[PDB]
PDB file of C-alpha atoms in Angstrom:
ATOM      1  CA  UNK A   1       0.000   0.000   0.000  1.00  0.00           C
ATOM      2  CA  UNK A   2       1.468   3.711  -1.279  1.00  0.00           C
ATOM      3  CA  UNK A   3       0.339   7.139  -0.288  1.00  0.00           C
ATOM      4  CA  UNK A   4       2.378  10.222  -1.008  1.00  0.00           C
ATOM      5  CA  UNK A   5       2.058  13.642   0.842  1.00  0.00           C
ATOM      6  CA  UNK A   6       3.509  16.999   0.161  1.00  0.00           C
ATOM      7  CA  UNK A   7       5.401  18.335   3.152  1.00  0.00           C
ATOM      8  CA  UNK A   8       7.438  20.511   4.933  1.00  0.00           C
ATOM      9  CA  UNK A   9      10.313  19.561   7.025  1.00  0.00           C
ATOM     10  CA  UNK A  10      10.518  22.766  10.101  1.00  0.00           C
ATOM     11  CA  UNK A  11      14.143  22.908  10.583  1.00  0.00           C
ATOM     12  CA  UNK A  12      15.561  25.716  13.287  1.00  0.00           C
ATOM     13  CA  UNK A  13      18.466  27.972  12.566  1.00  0.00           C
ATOM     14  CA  UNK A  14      21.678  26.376  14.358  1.00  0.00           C
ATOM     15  CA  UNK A  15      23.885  29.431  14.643  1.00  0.00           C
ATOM     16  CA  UNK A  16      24.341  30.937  18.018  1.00  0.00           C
ATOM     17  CA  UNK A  17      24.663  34.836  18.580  1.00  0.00           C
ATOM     18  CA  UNK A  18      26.493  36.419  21.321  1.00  0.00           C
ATOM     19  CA  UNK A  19      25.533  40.155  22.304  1.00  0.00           C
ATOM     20  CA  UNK A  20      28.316  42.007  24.608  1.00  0.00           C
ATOM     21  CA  UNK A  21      26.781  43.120  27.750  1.00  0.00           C
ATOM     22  CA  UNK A  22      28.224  44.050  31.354  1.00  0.00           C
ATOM     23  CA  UNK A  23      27.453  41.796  33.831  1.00  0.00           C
ATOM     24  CA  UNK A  24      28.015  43.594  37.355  1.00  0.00           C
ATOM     25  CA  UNK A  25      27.651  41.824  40.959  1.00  0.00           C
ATOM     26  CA  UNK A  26      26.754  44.694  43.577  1.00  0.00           C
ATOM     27  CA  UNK A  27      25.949  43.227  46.670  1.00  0.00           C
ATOM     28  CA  UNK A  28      23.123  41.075  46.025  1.00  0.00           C
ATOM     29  CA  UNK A  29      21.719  42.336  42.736  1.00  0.00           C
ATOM     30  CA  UNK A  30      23.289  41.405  39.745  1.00  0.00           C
ATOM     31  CA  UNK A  31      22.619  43.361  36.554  1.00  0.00           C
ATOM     32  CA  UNK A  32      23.060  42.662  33.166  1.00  0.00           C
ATOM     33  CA  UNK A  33      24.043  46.093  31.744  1.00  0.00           C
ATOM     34  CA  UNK A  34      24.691  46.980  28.216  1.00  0.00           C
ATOM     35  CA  UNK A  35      27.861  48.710  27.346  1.00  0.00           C
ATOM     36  CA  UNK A  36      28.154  52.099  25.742  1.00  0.00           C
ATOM     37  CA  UNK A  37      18.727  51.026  24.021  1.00  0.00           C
ATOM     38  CA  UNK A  38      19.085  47.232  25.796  1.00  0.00           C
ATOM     39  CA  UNK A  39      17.802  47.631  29.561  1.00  0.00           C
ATOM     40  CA  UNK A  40      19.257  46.740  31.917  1.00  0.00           C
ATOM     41  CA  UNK A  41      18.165  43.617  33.748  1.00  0.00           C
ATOM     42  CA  UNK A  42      18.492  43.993  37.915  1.00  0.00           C
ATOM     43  CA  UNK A  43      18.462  40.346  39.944  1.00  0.00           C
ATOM     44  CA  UNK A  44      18.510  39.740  42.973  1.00  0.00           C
ATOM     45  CA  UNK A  45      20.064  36.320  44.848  1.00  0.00           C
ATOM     46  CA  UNK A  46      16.806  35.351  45.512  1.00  0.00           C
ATOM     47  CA  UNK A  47      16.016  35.147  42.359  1.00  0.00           C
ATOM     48  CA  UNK A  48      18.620  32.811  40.697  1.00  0.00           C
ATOM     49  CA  UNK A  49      17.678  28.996  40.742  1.00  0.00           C
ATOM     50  CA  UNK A  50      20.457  27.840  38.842  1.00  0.00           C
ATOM     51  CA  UNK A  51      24.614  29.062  38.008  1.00  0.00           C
ATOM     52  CA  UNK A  52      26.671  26.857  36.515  1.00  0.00           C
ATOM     53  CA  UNK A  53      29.789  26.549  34.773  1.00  0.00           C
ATOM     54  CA  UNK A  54      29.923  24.845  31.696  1.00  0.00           C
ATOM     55  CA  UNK A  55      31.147  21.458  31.231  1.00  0.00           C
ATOM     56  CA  UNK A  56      32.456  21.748  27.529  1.00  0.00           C
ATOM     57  CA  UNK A  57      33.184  25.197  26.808  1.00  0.00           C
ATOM     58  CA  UNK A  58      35.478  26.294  29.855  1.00  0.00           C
ATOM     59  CA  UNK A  59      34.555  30.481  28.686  1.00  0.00           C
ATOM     60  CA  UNK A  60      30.414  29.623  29.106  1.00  0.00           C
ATOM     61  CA  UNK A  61      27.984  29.960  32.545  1.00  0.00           C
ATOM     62  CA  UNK A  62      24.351  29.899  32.689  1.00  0.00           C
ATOM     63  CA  UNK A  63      22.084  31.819  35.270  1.00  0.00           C
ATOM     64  CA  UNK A  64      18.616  30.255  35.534  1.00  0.00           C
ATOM     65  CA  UNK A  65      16.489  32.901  37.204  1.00  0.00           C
ATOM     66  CA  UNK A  66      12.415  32.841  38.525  1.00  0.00           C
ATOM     67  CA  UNK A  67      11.010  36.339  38.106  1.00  0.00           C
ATOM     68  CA  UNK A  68       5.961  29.612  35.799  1.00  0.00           C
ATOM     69  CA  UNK A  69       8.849  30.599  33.746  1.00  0.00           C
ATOM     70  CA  UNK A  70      12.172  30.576  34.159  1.00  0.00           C
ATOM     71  CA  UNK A  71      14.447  32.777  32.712  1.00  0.00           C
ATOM     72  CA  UNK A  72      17.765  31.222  30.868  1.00  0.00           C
ATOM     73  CA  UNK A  73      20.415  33.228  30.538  1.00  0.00           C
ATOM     74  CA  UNK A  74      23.639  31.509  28.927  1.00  0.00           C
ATOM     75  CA  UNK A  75      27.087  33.724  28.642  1.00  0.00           C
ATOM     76  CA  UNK A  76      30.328  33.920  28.118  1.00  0.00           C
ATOM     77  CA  UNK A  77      32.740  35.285  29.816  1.00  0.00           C
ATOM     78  CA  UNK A  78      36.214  37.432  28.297  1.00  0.00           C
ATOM     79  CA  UNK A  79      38.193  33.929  29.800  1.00  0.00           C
ATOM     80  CA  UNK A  80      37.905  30.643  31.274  1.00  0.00           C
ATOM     81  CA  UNK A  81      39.773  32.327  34.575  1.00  0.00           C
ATOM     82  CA  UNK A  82      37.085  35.102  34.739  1.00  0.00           C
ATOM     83  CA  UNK A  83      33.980  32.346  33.751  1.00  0.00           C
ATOM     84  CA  UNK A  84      35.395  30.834  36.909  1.00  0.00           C
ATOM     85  CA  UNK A  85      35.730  33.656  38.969  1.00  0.00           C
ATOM     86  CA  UNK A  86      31.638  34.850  38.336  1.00  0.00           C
ATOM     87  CA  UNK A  87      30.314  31.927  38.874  1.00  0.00           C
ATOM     88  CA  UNK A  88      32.355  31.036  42.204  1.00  0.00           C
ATOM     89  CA  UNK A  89      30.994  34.498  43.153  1.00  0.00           C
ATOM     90  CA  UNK A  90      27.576  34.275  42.744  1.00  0.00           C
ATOM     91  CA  UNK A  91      28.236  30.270  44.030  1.00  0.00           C
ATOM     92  CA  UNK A  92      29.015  31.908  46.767  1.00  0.00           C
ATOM     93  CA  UNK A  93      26.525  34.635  46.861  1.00  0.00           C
ATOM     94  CA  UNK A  94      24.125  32.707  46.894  1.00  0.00           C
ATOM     95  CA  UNK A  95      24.916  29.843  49.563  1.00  0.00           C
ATOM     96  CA  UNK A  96      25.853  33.010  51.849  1.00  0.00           C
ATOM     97  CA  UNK A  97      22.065  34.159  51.014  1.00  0.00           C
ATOM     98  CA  UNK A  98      20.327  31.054  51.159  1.00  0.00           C
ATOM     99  CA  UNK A  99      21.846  30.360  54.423  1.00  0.00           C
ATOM    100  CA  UNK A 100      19.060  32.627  56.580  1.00  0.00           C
TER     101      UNK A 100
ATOM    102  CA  UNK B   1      30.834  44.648  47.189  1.00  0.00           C
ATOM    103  CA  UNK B   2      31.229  45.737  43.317  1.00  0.00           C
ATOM    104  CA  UNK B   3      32.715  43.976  40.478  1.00  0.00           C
ATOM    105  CA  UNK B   4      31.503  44.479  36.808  1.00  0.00           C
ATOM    106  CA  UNK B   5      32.326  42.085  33.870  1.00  0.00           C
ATOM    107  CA  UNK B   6      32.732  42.131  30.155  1.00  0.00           C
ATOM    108  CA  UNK B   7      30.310  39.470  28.960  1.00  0.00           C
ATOM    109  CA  UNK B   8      28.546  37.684  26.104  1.00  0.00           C
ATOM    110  CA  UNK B   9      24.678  36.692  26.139  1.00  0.00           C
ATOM    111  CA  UNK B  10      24.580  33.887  23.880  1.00  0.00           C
ATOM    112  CA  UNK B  11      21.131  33.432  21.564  1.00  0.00           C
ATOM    113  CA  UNK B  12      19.990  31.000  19.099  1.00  0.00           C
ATOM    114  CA  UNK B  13      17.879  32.472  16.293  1.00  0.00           C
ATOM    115  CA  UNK B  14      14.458  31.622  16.782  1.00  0.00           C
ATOM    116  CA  UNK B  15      13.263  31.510  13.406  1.00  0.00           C
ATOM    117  CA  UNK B  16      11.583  28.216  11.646  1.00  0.00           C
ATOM    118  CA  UNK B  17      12.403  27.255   8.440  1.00  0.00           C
ATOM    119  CA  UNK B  18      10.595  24.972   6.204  1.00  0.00           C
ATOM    120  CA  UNK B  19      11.649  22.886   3.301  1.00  0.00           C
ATOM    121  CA  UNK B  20       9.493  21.061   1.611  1.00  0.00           C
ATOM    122  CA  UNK B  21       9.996  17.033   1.202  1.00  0.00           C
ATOM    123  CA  UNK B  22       7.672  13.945  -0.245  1.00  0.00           C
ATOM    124  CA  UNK B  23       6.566  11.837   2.949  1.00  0.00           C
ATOM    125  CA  UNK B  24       5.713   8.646   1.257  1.00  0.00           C
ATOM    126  CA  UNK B  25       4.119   5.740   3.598  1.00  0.00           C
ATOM    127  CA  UNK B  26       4.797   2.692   1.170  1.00  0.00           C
ATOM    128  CA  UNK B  27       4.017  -0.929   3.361  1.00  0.00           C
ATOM    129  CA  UNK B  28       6.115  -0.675   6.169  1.00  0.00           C
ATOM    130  CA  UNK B  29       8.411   2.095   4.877  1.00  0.00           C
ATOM    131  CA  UNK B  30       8.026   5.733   5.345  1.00  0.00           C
ATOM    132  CA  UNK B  31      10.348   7.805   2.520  1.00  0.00           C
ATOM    133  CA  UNK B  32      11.232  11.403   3.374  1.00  0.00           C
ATOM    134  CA  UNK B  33      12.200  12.430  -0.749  1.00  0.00           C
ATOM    135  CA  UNK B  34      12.719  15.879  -1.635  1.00  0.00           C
ATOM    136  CA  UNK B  35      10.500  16.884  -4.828  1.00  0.00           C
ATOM    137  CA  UNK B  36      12.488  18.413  -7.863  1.00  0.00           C
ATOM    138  CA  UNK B  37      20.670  16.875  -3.621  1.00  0.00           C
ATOM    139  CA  UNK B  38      19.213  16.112  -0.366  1.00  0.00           C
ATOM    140  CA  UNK B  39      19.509  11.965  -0.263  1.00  0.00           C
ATOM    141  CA  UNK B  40      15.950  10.233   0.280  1.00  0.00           C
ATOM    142  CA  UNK B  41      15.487   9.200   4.631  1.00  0.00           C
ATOM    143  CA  UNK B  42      14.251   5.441   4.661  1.00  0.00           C
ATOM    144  CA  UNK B  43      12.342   4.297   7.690  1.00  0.00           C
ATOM    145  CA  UNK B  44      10.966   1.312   8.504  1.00  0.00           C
ATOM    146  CA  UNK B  45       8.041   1.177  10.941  1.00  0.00           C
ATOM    147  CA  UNK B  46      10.021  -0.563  13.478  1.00  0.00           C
ATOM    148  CA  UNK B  47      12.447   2.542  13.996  1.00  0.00           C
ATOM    149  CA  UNK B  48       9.571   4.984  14.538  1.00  0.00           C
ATOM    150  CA  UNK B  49       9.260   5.599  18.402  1.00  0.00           C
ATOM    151  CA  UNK B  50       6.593   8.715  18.070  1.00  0.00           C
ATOM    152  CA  UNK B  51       4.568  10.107  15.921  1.00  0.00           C
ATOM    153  CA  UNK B  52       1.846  12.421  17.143  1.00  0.00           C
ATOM    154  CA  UNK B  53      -0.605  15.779  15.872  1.00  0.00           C
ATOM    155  CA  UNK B  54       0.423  18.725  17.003  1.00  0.00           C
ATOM    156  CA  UNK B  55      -1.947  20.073  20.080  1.00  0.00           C
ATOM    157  CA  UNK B  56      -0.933  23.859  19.205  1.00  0.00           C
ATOM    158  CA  UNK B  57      -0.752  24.127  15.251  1.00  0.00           C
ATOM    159  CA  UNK B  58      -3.062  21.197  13.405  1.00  0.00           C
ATOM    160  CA  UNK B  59      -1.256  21.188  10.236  1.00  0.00           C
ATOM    161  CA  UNK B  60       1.824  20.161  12.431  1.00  0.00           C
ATOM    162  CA  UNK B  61       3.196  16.500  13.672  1.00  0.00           C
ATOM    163  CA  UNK B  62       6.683  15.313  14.711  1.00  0.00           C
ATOM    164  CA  UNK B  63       7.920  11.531  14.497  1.00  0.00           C
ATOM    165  CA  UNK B  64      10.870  10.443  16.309  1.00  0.00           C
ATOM    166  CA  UNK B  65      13.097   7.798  14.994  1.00  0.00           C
ATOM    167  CA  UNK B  66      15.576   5.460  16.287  1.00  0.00           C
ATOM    168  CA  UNK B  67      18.341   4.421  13.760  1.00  0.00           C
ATOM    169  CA  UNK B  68      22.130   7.179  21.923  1.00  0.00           C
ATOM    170  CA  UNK B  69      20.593   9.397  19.563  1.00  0.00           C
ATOM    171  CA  UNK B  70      17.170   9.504  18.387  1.00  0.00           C
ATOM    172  CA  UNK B  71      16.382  11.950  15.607  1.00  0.00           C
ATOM    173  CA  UNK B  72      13.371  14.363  15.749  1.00  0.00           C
ATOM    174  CA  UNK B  73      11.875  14.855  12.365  1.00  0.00           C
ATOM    175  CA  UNK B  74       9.093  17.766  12.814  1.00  0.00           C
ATOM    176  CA  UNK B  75       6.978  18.429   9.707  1.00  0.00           C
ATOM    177  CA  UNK B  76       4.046  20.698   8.600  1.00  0.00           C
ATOM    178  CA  UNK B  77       1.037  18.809   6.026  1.00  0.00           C
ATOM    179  CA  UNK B  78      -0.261  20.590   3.156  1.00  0.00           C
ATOM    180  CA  UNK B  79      -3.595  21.312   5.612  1.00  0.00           C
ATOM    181  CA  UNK B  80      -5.012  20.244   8.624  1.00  0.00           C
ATOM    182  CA  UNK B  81      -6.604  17.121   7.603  1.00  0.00           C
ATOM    183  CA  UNK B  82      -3.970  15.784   5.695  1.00  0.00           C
ATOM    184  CA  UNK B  83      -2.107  16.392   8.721  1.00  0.00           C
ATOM    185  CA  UNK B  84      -4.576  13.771  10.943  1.00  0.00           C
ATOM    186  CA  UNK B  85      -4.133  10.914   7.800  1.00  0.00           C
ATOM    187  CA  UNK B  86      -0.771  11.336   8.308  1.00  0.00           C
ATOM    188  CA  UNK B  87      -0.566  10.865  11.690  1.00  0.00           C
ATOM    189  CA  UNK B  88      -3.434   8.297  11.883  1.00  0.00           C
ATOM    190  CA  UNK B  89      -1.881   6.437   9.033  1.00  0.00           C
ATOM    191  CA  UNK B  90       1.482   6.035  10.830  1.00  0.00           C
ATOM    192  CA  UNK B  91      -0.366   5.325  13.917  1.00  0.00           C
ATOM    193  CA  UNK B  92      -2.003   2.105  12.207  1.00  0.00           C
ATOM    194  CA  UNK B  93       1.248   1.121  10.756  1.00  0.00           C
ATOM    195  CA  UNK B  94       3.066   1.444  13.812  1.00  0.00           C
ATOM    196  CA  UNK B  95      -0.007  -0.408  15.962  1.00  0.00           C
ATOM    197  CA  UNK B  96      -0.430  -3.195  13.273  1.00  0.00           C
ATOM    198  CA  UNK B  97       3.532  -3.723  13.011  1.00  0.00           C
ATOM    199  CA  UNK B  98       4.175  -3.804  16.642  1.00  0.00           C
ATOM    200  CA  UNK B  99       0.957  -6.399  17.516  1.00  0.00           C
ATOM    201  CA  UNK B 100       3.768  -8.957  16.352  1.00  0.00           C
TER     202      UNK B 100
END
């Protein structure tokens, strides 16, 4: 038995951008500045779920951040030394929050 | 405490694209042939894990094939109801084949 149908195969775009921004820890607020009409993002400790350094790509991170929806925000930092160095921060940050 | 750092937000490009393909249910094969480079897909029924309508878009359905790595094939039918024979088609193939 044959049948034959016209279709379309939905394929998404691979290719992954990366827009400079300034990411600044101040206290407990973090916010995701961009250098010199972006604006500018302000968390707070509370709010991040998740930071992580990547696994693969030693220059990546990831902040996962409630505001039902999470926020994802994946970057990359100038170095694997500085990736390091943010995300042992707000590590750190945050266990000294969570802590009360 | 204050420190500010140069950093990368990393996007994908959320746009679909959609190129069209023959989907071809002939016995217990499925053909994905483009219509006139791209080399014709041959599936049997036994390597098709999913295949289900779309809840959001009816013209949509997805089937998921196993060849560690299963591949997601997501596709959009001419309309709506060629989108449920499809599906319903597959279905039967996949419920008469796997009765054995």
């Amino acid at each position: 038995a044959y049948h034959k149908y016209k279709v379309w195969r939905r394929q998404q775009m691979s290719f992954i951008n990366k827009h400079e921004r300034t990411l600044a820890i101040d206290g407990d607020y973090i916010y995701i500045v961009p250098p010199e009409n972006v604006k500018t993002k302000s968390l707070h400790i509370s709010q991040v779920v998740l930071v992580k350094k990547s696994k693969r790509v030693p220059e990546h991170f990831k902040i996962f951040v409630r505001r039902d929806d999470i926020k994802r925000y994946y970057f990359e930092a100038v170095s694997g030394q500085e990736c390091t160095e943010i995300v042992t921060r707000l590590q750190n940050l945050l266990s000294a929050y969570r802590m009360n």
